[PDB]
């Protein structure tokens, strides 16, 4: 377990997919990595080659070469393909290379078994990586060092926010930050529909819906306030806001969102 | 005649409130205005005076003086106080000065009647002005010019996004972008409570909830995609996301949000 | 595994039922097959004799002879009868003949085991085959070739649309395209009942209901748009459409249809 | 009242919109008339010019000229613009010219008052005009003749189906065939979501959903059967279909669609 050179390490992606692309772009954009320090290899899809090459990244001809040339290897294939991919690469997965998985639903215990060592970090990002606003969580394998963690924190800091948590929380994380964006997509559409139902033009209703949600979440992120206090701040006496909030409460809105997180988390567990 | 000099105009706030402060800070930060080009007056509050003075803004002793010294006058008092305030200032409200109201629920027909002329713009911003992420909409009085509009765009573009709409849409705008942030504060708290119900630590649950909402709304704002399509992009077959979405649909989640916007809009009309 | 001659192959139906009749009529109508290239046999209903004979198709006296004279054999008996039928014919089911099942709920693993070889394609069509608007899906056995697939694509393309999917999706397919037509028959009656409730004559209400459904689905099939975008296109501000849509959303309409598909898919699995 | 020559009349569109374009294309496609017998004029956008010119239709410079050159004039501007457009053209609206409105929500009494005569036909088409599957209904003004009606039937027969009804039914028509497509778009999306919830790939689920609806509506339109008979035909005993239909019936699916039509029809009346 030699420390990974924090300022000069090379990064490899196994699986040149959307998430790999988002991470690469973020890391380049933030200056955490240069394109020359990133490698990947292309599978069945040739559309992908151009996506990486156009960022200045070298696309190699095999996964094996990506691993050989990389200090840090990110596995970003679909979860059901990961075990076979790791097993095939295993002879190259020496302990001087930090391994990372972004695969949804694959536990650290399994990752470590497959690779044959514990210098492994699991991350669960989410779809907003594409715009640099991912909610990501990492868990550390048994031999991942504090410096390894910092390196991954910096890397995933370049596509959003990143927190640390024990692996046993990941089903619930998956139901909240992994699946949650869809809940909000429904909400944005419904808010827009609501605006139209109240007489707004569609384009304006949808623009307002998206920015309202963006603004409110920015307030929650930056204000240092409890969401209840934020709600209190905007509910003027007898006003329009409390009229709307009351309709939400009549319908058990909060409990419906709780139900969605719980059901998604339970599904995550069932798929394990 | 008498276009307002786009690069040198002076701006006055009548009502040195939170919203006035947010607009002033934004305009300064963006370089649209310098502090020396902004004036306000404080009705009673010492705390308010230090808030403006600490960003370099001169606090005068009367509303009358703010009006005299300003090319553009923003009325940012509470709506129930606005009529008397405008009536008292009326002799000073000459047609060479562009007037702006941010007052919730006050229609353009009334603003113009109170002032005695039609060189008036109404804006409805929202609470996210504080973090530069307002959703704002403007409507033009009968003598507001295109250059007047541009000036107001630039100004409210400094604190979020700004759109234009007919005054008749404003009750619905109020129920959507004005009131919507509370609906999202509920959502954020509920999502966090869900995460805790699913076994997450509270701090992590809340951090994830807020950033999940922020990221999803950023995807909606940047992607160019319909929210349906964004939901399609994240609902993998038989996966955790579609499980959660299905719970939301069982409960009529979308309709509840529609209800809230509709109720808030109807409250707006009733108050008007 | 000799290629089936694409332009001259003969087709045999085992089970001279309604589905067989719809496939035969389609294939003849489209010019994919001529009647002289199609054979079937009755076992114990001679009324079926006249239905094939009247479209110019020869009706043989035994299933055995249909098989001998055919390059492609379609099994269109009731599912609970299929195994014994295939077992009886087995000595004649040589690998030069492509086998096809349209039997609901019978998996490829079983088809192949019964026949003793893997040159087998499963199709799940639906009721709209009768009017050349089936939604069909095919899965390929282990020895079905790409050319076999193309042949079956062209055949079932004559009674509607035909997609390819893995056999493991067929319970869900059965709940959606197999059972879905009933959901829409309910919808059509309900829309007609709604029109009558709103004061329309029954004959007009039913005509409008059916054609409204037809037109909307044709839009969805041709437009290249997401259904949400299509909904957005027709929901004018504060207008009649959004008022109707809002009543759907209040009631959880979407979730009810999701429930139906999920229940039907589960039932399919249980009947497995 | 001079008959409009049936085989040589010229047709003018006032408002070179989407619906005008659909009608023009349909009529040219079906051979009802040649492009040389059609005229329109262009307003705010010159993008429209090319849409008409590219099908061989002459685009004139004024509404006035379109009217002068046309025996049959179709008004296809947005409803809120129609009154002023008709009043401006009124001196040219001589009784030898058959007038037609496709405007949503504009009653025959008003049309006739604006034009100053009763040789007017109202049509309510729907969004599926774009694919030639409109559900349309016409009503006759007090001086519209049987031959005028036949001419308009033939014309609107080119973009779908066309029925006749008294003007007093048009609110309800609007809530059913006018607004109904959105109810079906919801249904298509929800069906697809259901498929996905049951484990289907999204692309397949959406393809199946759309074609399932199309095919069921085609069965309703062509079979001659009551929808209840059609539902009986596919609900095999104890099978997947009846399981899904039972879930719909548990939830009051039929009533929800009735509610949508009734609400949309009431809204139509309220707007009128
Ligand atoms: N996309 C997201 O928003 C998101 C969020 C959280 C987690 N994840 C995880 O990220 C991973 C990928 O997600 P995606 O959306 O990037 O998938 P994707 O399908 O875009 O990329 C997958 C890539 O892997 C390639 N591949 C397949 N087999 C391979 C092999 N044997 N060797 C090398 N490459 C191979 C595929 O060709 C494809 O390019 C998954 O594990 C998913 O759970 C994604
Ligand atoms: N704050 C928001 O998020 C938000 C959003 C949309 C619209 N608005 C509109 O902004 C306006 C102000 O909102 P706020 O939240 O800034 O109010 P605020 O109460 O923080 O500040 C209002 C100021 O007006 C001062 N005032 C009272 N009487 C006065 C007078 N006669 N002359 C001069 N000043 C006087 C008060 O002392 C106070 O400082 C309201 O009309 C509100 O509807 C605010
Ligand atoms: N009908 C549809 O719309 C539809 C839709 C999807 C799938 N399918 C599948 O199509 C198949 C046939 O459906 P149908 O509706 O045509 O049935 P059907 O009953 O009309 O025809 C079945 C025929 O098989 C004959 N038969 C019974 N035992 C036989 C044997 N041993 N040898 C030869 N013929 C025999 C019967 O006399 C009957 O004529 C079924 O497996 C069904 O699941 C039908
Ligand atoms: N589009 C549909 O599916 C549908 C369905 C039912 C009824 N309708 C009715 O059809 C009519 C048009 O619908 P659309 O969707 O075609 O509208 P659209 O906006 O595409 O076309 C309207 C056209 O009118 C033009 N216009 C504006 N002012 C004008 C003027 N003074 N003189 C001439 N042209 C002018 C606009 O530039 C635009 O090109 C509306 O009345 C609508 O209710 C449409
Ligand atoms: Cl409020
Ligand atoms: Cl998922
Ligand atoms: Cl509408
Ligand atoms: Cl069934």
Numbering used by the authors:
A (entry chain I), B (entry chain J), C (entry chain A), D (entry chain B): 3 to 274
Task: Copy out sentences from the published article reporting this entry, exactly as the authors wrote them.
The pathway preference appears to depend on nitrogen availability, being the ornithine route preferred under nitrogen-rich conditions. Both routes converge at the generation of P5C, which in the final step is reduced to L-proline by P5C reductase (P5CR, EC 1.5.1.2). Here we report the high-resolution crystal structure of P5CR from M. truncatula (Mt), a model legume plant. The donut-shaped decamer of MtP5CR can be described as a pentamer of symmetric, bean-like dimers that are related to each other by a five-fold NCS axis. The catalytic centers of P5CRs are located between the dinucleotide-binding domain (N-terminal) and the dimerization domain (C-terminal).
Concerning hydride donors, the complexes with NAD+ and NADP+ showed that both coenzymes are bound by the N-terminal domain of MtP5CR via multiple hydrogen bonds created mostly by the backbone N and O atoms of the protein. In the case of NAD+, the adenine N1 atom interacts with Nδ of Asn65. The N3 atom of adenine forms water-mediated hydrogen bonds with the backbone N and O of Ala18 and Ala43, respectively. Additionally, adenine interacts by π–stacking to His45 with an interplanar distance of about 3.6 Å and an inclination below 6°. The O atoms of the pyrophosphate group form strong ionic hydrogen bonds to the peptide amides of Lys20, Met21 and, via H2O, to Gly19 and Ala22. The nicotinamide-adjacent ribose forms two direct hydrogen bonds between O2′ and the backbone NH of Ala106, as well as between O3′ and the carbonyl of Val79. The si-side of the C4 carbon atom of the nicotinamide faces toward the catalytic center. This means that during the reduction reaction, the hydride would be transferred from the pro-S position of NAD(P)H. In the catalytic center of the enzyme, a MOPS molecule was also found in the structures with either coenzyme. NAD+ did not exert any inhibitory effect regardless of the coenzyme used.
